[PDB]
Amino acid sequence: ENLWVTVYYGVPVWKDAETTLFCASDAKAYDTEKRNVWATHCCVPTDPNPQEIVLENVTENFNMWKNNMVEQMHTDIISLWDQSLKPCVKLTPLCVTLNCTDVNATNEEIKNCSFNITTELRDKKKKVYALFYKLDVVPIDDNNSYRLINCNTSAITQACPKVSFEPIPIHYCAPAGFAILKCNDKKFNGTGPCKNVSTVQCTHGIKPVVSTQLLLNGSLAEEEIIIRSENITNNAKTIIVQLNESVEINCTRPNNNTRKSIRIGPGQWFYATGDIIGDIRQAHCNISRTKWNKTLQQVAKKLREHFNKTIIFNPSSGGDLEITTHSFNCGGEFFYCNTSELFNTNNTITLPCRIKQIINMWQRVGQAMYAPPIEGKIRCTSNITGLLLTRDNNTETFRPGGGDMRDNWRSELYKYKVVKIEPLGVAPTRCKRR
Amino acid sequence: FLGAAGSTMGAASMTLTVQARNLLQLTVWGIKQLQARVLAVERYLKDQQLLGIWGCSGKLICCTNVPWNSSWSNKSQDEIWDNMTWMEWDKEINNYTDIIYSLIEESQNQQEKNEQEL
Amino acid sequence: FLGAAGSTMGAASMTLTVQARNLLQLTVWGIKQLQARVLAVERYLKDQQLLGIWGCSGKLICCTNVPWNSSWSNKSQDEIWDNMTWMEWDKEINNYTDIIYSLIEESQNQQEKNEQEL
Amino acid sequence: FLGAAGSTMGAASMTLTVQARNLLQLTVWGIKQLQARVLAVERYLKDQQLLGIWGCSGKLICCTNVPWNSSWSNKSQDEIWDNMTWMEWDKEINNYTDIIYSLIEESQNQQEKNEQEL
Ligand SMILES: *[C@@H]1O[C@H](CO)[C@@H](O[C@@H]2O[C@H](CO)[C@@H](O[C@@H]3O[C@H](CO[C@H]4O[C@H](CO[C@H]5O[C@H](CO)[C@@H](O)[C@H](O)[C@@H]5O)[C@@H](O)[C@H](O)[C@@H]4O)[C@@H](O)[C@H](O[C@H]4O[C@H](CO)[C@@H](O)[C@H](O)[C@@H]4O[C@H]4O[C@H](CO)[C@@H](O)[C@H](O)[C@@H]4O)[C@@H]3O)[C@H](O)[C@H]2NC(C)=O)[C@H](O)[C@H]1NC(C)=O
Ligand SMILES: *[C@@H]1O[C@H](CO)[C@@H](O[C@@H]2O[C@H](CO)[C@@H](O[C@@H]3O[C@H](CO[C@H]4O[C@H](CO)[C@@H](O)[C@H](O)[C@@H]4O)[C@@H](O)[C@H](O)[C@@H]3O)[C@H](O)[C@H]2NC(C)=O)[C@H](O)[C@H]1NC(C)=O
Ligand SMILES: *[C@@H]1O[C@H](CO)[C@@H](O[C@@H]2O[C@H](CO)[C@@H](O[C@@H]3O[C@H](CO)[C@@H](O)[C@H](O)[C@@H]3O)[C@H](O)[C@H]2NC(C)=O)[C@H](O)[C@H]1NC(C)=O
Ligand SMILES: *[C@@H]1O[C@H](CO)[C@@H](O[C@@H]2O[C@H](CO)[C@@H](O[C@@H]3O[C@H](CO)[C@@H](O)[C@H](O)[C@@H]3O)[C@H](O)[C@H]2NC(C)=O)[C@H](O)[C@H]1NC(C)=O
Ligand SMILES: *[C@@H]1O[C@H](CO)[C@@H](O[C@@H]2O[C@H](CO)[C@@H](O)[C@H](O)[C@H]2NC(C)=O)[C@H](O)[C@H]1NC(C)=O
Ligand SMILES: *[C@@H]1O[C@H](CO)[C@@H](O[C@@H]2O[C@H](CO)[C@@H](O)[C@H](O)[C@H]2NC(C)=O)[C@H](O)[C@H]1NC(C)=O
Ligand SMILES: *[C@@H]1O[C@H](CO)[C@@H](O[C@@H]2O[C@H](CO)[C@@H](O)[C@H](O)[C@H]2NC(C)=O)[C@H](O)[C@H]1NC(C)=O
Ligand SMILES: *[C@@H]1O[C@H](CO)[C@@H](O[C@@H]2O[C@H](CO)[C@@H](O)[C@H](O)[C@H]2NC(C)=O)[C@H](O)[C@H]1NC(C)=O
Ligand SMILES: *[C@@H]1O[C@H](CO)[C@@H](O[C@@H]2O[C@H](CO)[C@@H](O)[C@H](O)[C@H]2NC(C)=O)[C@H](O)[C@H]1NC(C)=O
Ligand SMILES: *[C@@H]1O[C@H](CO)[C@@H](O[C@@H]2O[C@H](CO)[C@@H](O)[C@H](O)[C@H]2NC(C)=O)[C@H](O)[C@H]1NC(C)=O
Ligand SMILES: *[C@@H]1O[C@H](CO)[C@@H](O[C@@H]2O[C@H](CO)[C@@H](O)[C@H](O)[C@H]2NC(C)=O)[C@H](O)[C@H]1NC(C)=O
Ligand SMILES: *[C@@H]1O[C@H](CO)[C@@H](O[C@@H]2O[C@H](CO)[C@@H](O)[C@H](O)[C@H]2NC(C)=O)[C@H](O)[C@H]1NC(C)=O
Ligand SMILES: *[C@@H]1O[C@H](CO)[C@@H](O[C@@H]2O[C@H](CO)[C@@H](O)[C@H](O)[C@H]2NC(C)=O)[C@H](O)[C@H]1NC(C)=O
Numbered sequence A: 001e002n003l004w005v006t007v008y009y010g011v012p013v014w015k016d017a018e019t020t021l022f023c024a025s026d027a028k029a030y031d032t033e034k035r036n037v038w039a040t041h042c043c044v045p046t047d048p049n050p051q052e053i054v055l056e057n058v059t060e061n062f063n064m065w066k067n068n069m070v071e072q073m074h075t076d077i078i079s080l081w082d083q084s085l086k087p088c089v090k091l092t093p094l095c096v097t098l099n100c101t102d103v104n105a106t107n108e109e110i111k112n113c114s115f116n117i118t119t120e121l122r123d124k125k126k127k128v129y130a131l132f133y134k135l136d137v138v139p140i141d142d143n144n145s146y147r148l149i150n151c152n153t154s155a156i157t158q159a160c161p162k163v164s165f166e167p168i169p170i171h172y173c174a175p176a177g178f179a180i181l182k183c184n185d186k187k188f189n190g191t192g193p194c195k196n197v198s199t200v201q202c203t204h205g206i207k208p209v210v211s212t213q214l215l216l217n218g219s220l221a222e223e224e225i226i227i228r229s230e231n232i233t234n235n236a237k238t239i240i241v242q243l244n245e246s247v248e249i250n251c252t253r254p255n256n257n258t259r260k261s262i263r264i265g266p267g268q269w270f271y272a273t274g275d276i277i278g279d280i281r282q283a284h285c286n287i288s289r290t291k292w293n294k295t296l297q298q299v300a301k302k303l304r305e306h307f308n309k310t311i312i313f314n315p316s317s318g319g320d321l322e323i324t325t326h327s328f329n330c331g332g333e334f335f336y337c338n339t340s341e342l343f344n345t346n347n348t349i350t351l352p353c354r355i356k357q358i359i360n361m362w363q364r365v366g367q368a369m370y371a372p373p374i375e376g377k378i379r380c381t382s383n384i385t386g387l388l389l390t391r392d393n394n395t396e397t398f399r400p401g402g403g404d405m406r407d408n409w410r411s412e413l414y415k416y417k418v419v420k421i422e423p424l425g426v427a428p429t430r431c432k433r434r
Numbered sequence B, C, D: 001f002l003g004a005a006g007s008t009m010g011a012a013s014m015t016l017t018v019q020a021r022n023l024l025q026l027t028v029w030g031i032k033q034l035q036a037r038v039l040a041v042e043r044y045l046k047d048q049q050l051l052g053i054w055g056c057s058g059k060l061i062c063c064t065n066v067p068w069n070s071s072w073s074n075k076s077q078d079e080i081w082d083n084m085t086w087m088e089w090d091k092e093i094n095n096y097t098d099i100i101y102s103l104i105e106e107s108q109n110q111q112e113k114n115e116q117e118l
């Protein structure tokens, strides 16, 4: 029992920690001409053969709701968008009274407007035309006098015409002294001890896909639909449902669009929607009815395990398109699709969609962005991998959620935790210094 | 790395070398990365300084003076170095770090260096 | 500094103190300089950490265990420390550095610390 | 900290632990603070490097070779370690620091390490 203090260094223990993770990208497939916003060309390539180490006999407690990786990812995404939009041309010179008539959507939603704009020499103005979607144009008068929708609240910035916003899976890696732990429990919900925990050099890549009511292009649950909620009895919480099978969604912009490049100053270019070629058609999304119903039958079945009540689904209740519709980006275009036929035979469900160009991202009102037109037609294929639901008796009512973008990454980052290494400690020995 | 995290503290001593070894644009993103480099260095040095003052600078395992208390641990060495793991040990002895470090740092540095000069 | 760079490796062992000693606005220009300072520190520390794990922390010349291979060198020590220079030596053993370092880090850290506690 | 700053140099040898121990947004305010942290690290390391080259890395008090000059000090150890304080001592030996450091670095480094290999 002649036990003396021994100092140990390199002791394999850790504590929960909040630190800064760094960007890593496995793909270096893209060049520097494509200019993807996530192609930072500042961040390190990943290790093509990363090492995952299983920690036997450990029981790490995970918590997706208090996870700080979600907030960090959120902040960095906002930052990258502002950094890439900042240097481009402002559209504040277009905040003028618009003279508008309808396009020949004749025998609706596209307006043909004229402007008086400043040319490179300040004493001269030119009369120009552009087409606009109704959602971006607000009547001023009872006469045909309109304004751009956000000129009465803030500046509008044009998105850079050469910057791509197509998601690239981004890996989040820890700095030296830190480690990322992950849970490998197939039935694991948002919180609790994980009996199978491994340590990784870093996370897999997560694509920064933006969506609202439906979660697109994410990962799947391995065995069953897993429903994760911070507080399952609190109707105000978002319920995140991860599917164990994907559903394909086919979206398109059937019109052949054109682009008009308009000078609005000395190197200040504006990209206007040009003429419409061919038929005027409505944008839409295609979801197979049978896959949709099968999926929803299983979602209710699993939800019933928590409520023991009849479960029904209803359409979104109201509010701005950003909340009431399935808002997503595809190909650089911004779609707002109706989901009333989903949340409510053997055909395909066709959802009408609306398109708008002036976007207030992440509820930051006053930071409006103008999305320039894309020429030609748009074809999108995406995977529905999950749902965001909220709740409103012997029957429970679920409705599409969304709005808060944090939930979209929380749904992927639930598997990871950040801890820091604390290599020093002491224990008794029979060895003393002398 | 951490392969022995759930293992016997004694056995885990064979990983101390790896556990120690891997400790080492003008944008917001860029400054955050520079901050990360700096804090990693500062954390490293604080541990090295402490090993330094304790007289354990050249060691991963350092035997010092100061006996064990029953108020710190009442277990035999047979549980401690055979049946218990480092995470579990840390769970119990975490409340005594501010006692033990101070006891080593003053007493075993000052008494020892004075005798060495003399 | 580097006066003996083209000289005999043996003779150059007498210049190690200088070679070791000289290792130590909100603008773009300013951040580049700060970044450079941090990186210099990291390089210094990495070498010190490695000497530390090898048990060579207090030495410029450190004798360790692990014998030489014929694949590493087929020259006698008489050629090596008399006619060869450090640049020439580096040219020959450059492809065995990872090998030698691994051999030292594990074998000579574990055998020595385990026996010292015992 | 500095409690013995005005006291006897000998007595102050018991306070070296604390004196040695407490040495460790994208705005201009933020960069200045980061620069300050980097400097503190650099200063710390320069002192450690010097103790290292002198063979004093593990010590707060390090006895070396090189006798004292009458040109450096003409006082006995009885005044120096009993009546004088560290501030007063620094006032007298301030002009000899470069001399002493140079002598130690070359002589006591290279002669000693060469003899040890041999
Ligand atoms: C969920 O995941 C899914 C699955 O990944 C995502 O779905 C993908 O989304 C992609 C982006 O929306 C989409 O990619 C576009 O596809 C268009 C049509 O594809 C046909 O033609 C390509 C030709 O490929 C070859 O040429 C390109 C040119 O760069 C090369 O890059 C390739 O390597 C090849 O050499 C075929 O490969 C396809 O099989 C089809 O036949 C393309 O036209 C489009 O390219 C243009 O836009 C790019 C945007 O970055 C740009 O980089 C590229 O250079 C092109 O733009 C130039 O040319 C046009 C021509 O008018 C010009 O106007 C521009 O100014 C510029 O000069 C993309 O390649 C994927 O096809 C799609 N996958 C599927 C199965 O549909 C889904 O988006 C994601 N969902 C969510 C919500 O995130
Ligand atoms: C949206 O509308 C656009 C404008 O009409 C469409 O572009 C047109 O697409 C047709 C496809 O048949 C092209 O016709 C072919 O042209 C090539 C020769 O092209 C080259 O020479 C022409 C001369 O004007 C030049 O304009 C082109 O840029 C090329 O240099 C012929 O060899 C073929 O036989 C055939 O005639 C049109 O030329 C093309 N017009 C333009 C201005 O590009 C666009 O395809 C439509 N998009 C969709 C999705 O429907
Ligand atoms: C998705 O598309 C559906 C229809 O396909 C939209 O539902 C329709 O919404 C309008 C809202 O004005 C309803 O009109 C109102 O109906 C009530 C009925 O009493 C009437 O009193 C009001 O004066 C007004 O006419 C319309 O009836 C309703 N259609 C159906 C079949 O219910 C839905 O709003 C679209 N959602 C999104 C997010 O775009
Ligand atoms: C939506 O989810 C489905 C099901 O996971 C996806 O289908 C799968 O897509 C991957 C793409 O890498 C296929 O992997 C590769 O397929 C090629 C085919 O020649 C094969 O040679 C490669 O070795 C590799 O297996 C995978 O097989 C395919 N699964 C099935 C059952 O076809 C679909 O792509 C997803 N859609 C979206 C928009 O992400
Ligand atoms: C615990 O999690 C680990 C992953 O960390 C699982 O190990 C993987 O198992 C699959 C099975 O095919 C192998 O292909 C992988 O190569 C294994 N990965 C590693 C890192 O070894 C393990 O099977 C899980 N165990 C349980 C009980 O779920
Ligand atoms: C622009 O404003 C004018 C009137 O302020 C709109 O009406 C036109 O007025 C001129 C006056 O000479 C008539 O010759 C045109 O025939 C009128 N147009 C129509 C359709 O009656 C004009 O429509 C407005 N619209 C645009 C896009 O310029
Ligand atoms: C700004 O737009 C207005 C229309 O909204 C232009 O006013 C018309 O200009 C034409 C030019 O000959 C006149 O014939 C019309 O009578 C004007 N309308 C009215 C109601 O008087 C105005 O000229 C444009 N400014 C510039 C610089 O083009
Ligand atoms: C300036 O913007 C504010 C909103 O910040 C406008 O107020 C609301 O605008 C919406 C747009 O559809 C209307 O539906 C609301 O009814 C408006 N509020 C009220 C109380 O009527 C405001 O009207 C905008 N200014 C102008 C001149 O349109
Ligand atoms: C998944 O959710 C279930 C609850 O539906 C968790 O079970 C525990 O339930 C009791 C009931 O009193 C709570 O007090 C516990 O706090 C719940 N556990 C947790 C971690 O909160 C189940 O444990 C959850 N998943 C995991 C991985 O444990
Ligand atoms: C979900 O949250 C609600 C409240 O947000 C919890 O239930 C209520 O908690 C408040 C706290 O002051 C009490 O005053 C109420 O009386 C509680 N409600 C009831 C019916 O007792 C609820 O327990 C949480 N549920 C889960 C699963 O975490
Ligand atoms: C979405 O688009 C894809 C691609 O065309 C459709 O996949 C095709 O489906 C038909 C149906 O029998 C198959 O014969 C084709 O071979 C499939 N093509 C490919 C490339 O797999 C998919 O069915 C569409 N989804 C919807 C809802 O219409
Ligand atoms: C997790 O605990 C198990 C059980 O103690 C460890 O398995 C033992 O490993 C030793 C190694 O010499 C064997 O002698 C025992 O016979 C094994 N026990 C059984 C029941 O097979 C396992 O190695 C531990 N893993 C970690 C990381 O500690
Ligand atoms: C470059 O090489 C020459 C000879 O190859 C070195 O000169 C020798 O220096 C030693 C010093 O004791 C003398 O004993 C030899 O006699 C000299 N050799 C000749 C041929 O004169 C010279 O010092 C070397 N310089 C460096 C930096 O290595």
Ligand SMILES: *[C@@H]1O[C@H](CO)[C@@H](O[C@@H]2O[C@H](CO)[C@@H](O)[C@H](O)[C@H]2NC(C)=O)[C@H](O)[C@H]1NC(C)=O
Binding pocket: D003, D004, D005, D006, D007, D008
């Ligand atoms: C300042 O100087 C005074 C005396 O000059 C110090 O006081 C002495 O403290 C020792 C402590 O053992 C006593 O034995 C002496 O008798 C004291 N001297 C007198 C005259 O009382 C005092 O401690 C010094 N303070 C510092 C910081 O050096």
Ligand SMILES: *[C@@H]1O[C@H](CO)[C@@H](O)[C@H](O)[C@H]1NC(C)=O
Binding pocket: A222, A223, A224, A225, A244, A245, A298
């Ligand atoms: C999960 O996917 C598998 C795939 O075969 C399927 O058999 C299983 O029934 C699915 N479970 C749910 C709840 O969708």
Ligand SMILES: *[C@@H]1O[C@H](CO)[C@@H](O)[C@H](O)[C@H]1NC(C)=O
Binding pocket: A344
């Ligand atoms: C959709 O909602 C309408 C509301 O009247 C209802 O009549 C219809 O049956 C619903 N469709 C489905 C598939 O539930």
Ligand SMILES: *[C@@H]1O[C@H](CO)[C@@H](O)[C@H](O)[C@H]1NC(C)=O
Binding pocket: B067, B068, B069, B070, B071
């Ligand atoms: C144990 O802690 C008590 C607390 O007062 C202390 O007095 C005693 O000396 C300690 N024993 C050891 C071995 O440190």
Ligand SMILES: *[C@@H]1O[C@H](CO)[C@@H](O)[C@H](O)[C@H]1NC(C)=O
Binding pocket: C066, C067, C068, C069, C070, C071
């Ligand atoms: C020399 O290389 C051979 C090749 O495998 C190796 O087996 C042997 O142990 C090496 N000797 C030394 C000193 O490393």
Ligand SMILES: *[C@@H]1O[C@H](CO)[C@@H](O)[C@H](O)[C@H]1NC(C)=O
Binding pocket: D066, D067, D068, D069, D070, D071
């Ligand atoms: C004292 O200074 C003289 C000046 O030349 C020097 O020669 C002598 O060696 C020095 N003594 C010591 C102890 O360095």
